[PDB]
Amino acid sequence: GAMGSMERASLIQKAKLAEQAERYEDMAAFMKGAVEKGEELSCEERNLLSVAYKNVVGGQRAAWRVLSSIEQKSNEEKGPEVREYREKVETELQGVCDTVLGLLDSHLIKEAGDAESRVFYLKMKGDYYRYLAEVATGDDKKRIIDSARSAYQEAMDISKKEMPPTNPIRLGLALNFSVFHYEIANSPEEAISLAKTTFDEAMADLHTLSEDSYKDSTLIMQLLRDNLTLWT
Template sequence: MSPVKVTLSRLDRLFLARVADQAERYQDVVDQIKDLASLSEGLLTVDERNLLSIAYKNLTSNLRNGWRTIDTLEKKGGHTQRQISLMRVEKQRIRDELVRACKDVVDLMDSQLIPFASPGEEKVFYSKMKGDYYRYLAEFSKGESNDQSGAKSLDAYKWAYKHALTTLEPTHPTRLGLALNFAVYYHDIMDSPERACFLAKHAFDAAISVLSSQGTKALPVHTVEDTLMILQLLRDDMILWAGEFM
């Protein structure tokens, strides 16, 4: 019996994406949301956008963690040269898969999502994602590829941050999340804990100033938890990084 062809509506695809997310089938989530983006000319709802972001995050986090686990095992020593060679082969396989996933993200951002995003939070969100995945590429690339990915990550972060400063409140979680990841870029890719601390402190102080004068009641109810969580992460990173240059 030949399979029955079913025409899927937008709600059908969103439902399937949510089911795939619950089943931890993150590539299936990506595929459904990418189809939605194509059908809707790059316009995604907040729910669709968040599902896409979480799916890509899980896909790449698993790969990054896998590579680091094998790298740690390799560095522990006590392995034969043959075993070391096999571990390096596996690390290269993981790196290649990670590169494909990251390039898939930035291609989607550039071709379908950023060009049609609304000014403000949506534009910042997608540009931040672009910066994040170029940063991951820079982490696992070597030589000229590392330099190119690092430069593209910096460009995306700079544009997003400049746009965020003029369109989003200092307490907005998307603006704070961008500041956090941009600071991580300066620390991890540029090897500059001082610049990372400066950026993190600027974002932290601006948000705290608002909260000191207005309190959390001034924040939308659905953002309070995210805002406070990111502020804590900024604070923790500042303390950690400050010890590296003071």
């Protein structure tokens, strides 16, 4: 690959410079090159990978939503331009999701390693299928929804067995799986029930956490609570 001649340590250093420069496409390319060295990622490295691609895909999802809205407001009756441009953005978004899903399958998702790492990557797999599901139609969408559910469910099973209710990876997975239920799977009752259980069981354990831990967990609990506010 394009990063094949660069030292792993140098790719991680350049990913952090890219993040400081808000150059997220560069950050993602450096992190992909580091993953392709075939060594495990540290906790910090996983977060760099996640930040890089979340920012790339985030800009494409926001663009697709702007163009989709303009497209739907002009479908009350025109010209092909809004549809053509929305299709172009959609194909780019799909390209990024396919890149991430390929890295997860080829390099990162293993039977071994700590629960936190396994949950982190299966959650990412569910997230990137969820993004494909947002733009998919027909048979393809049904296949993608099944893939998303299967990755999220596998991560939920591990997180419930191996991590405490306030673990931020466990919380973030439950938040995202609840959004999957609500917005993709059209199961609002499952979305609400999951969010409420996650929030309540975390609330019971807060007194046990250190300063840094308390911050990380309550940030995610506030998002759970905001969705419950919106949904109920």
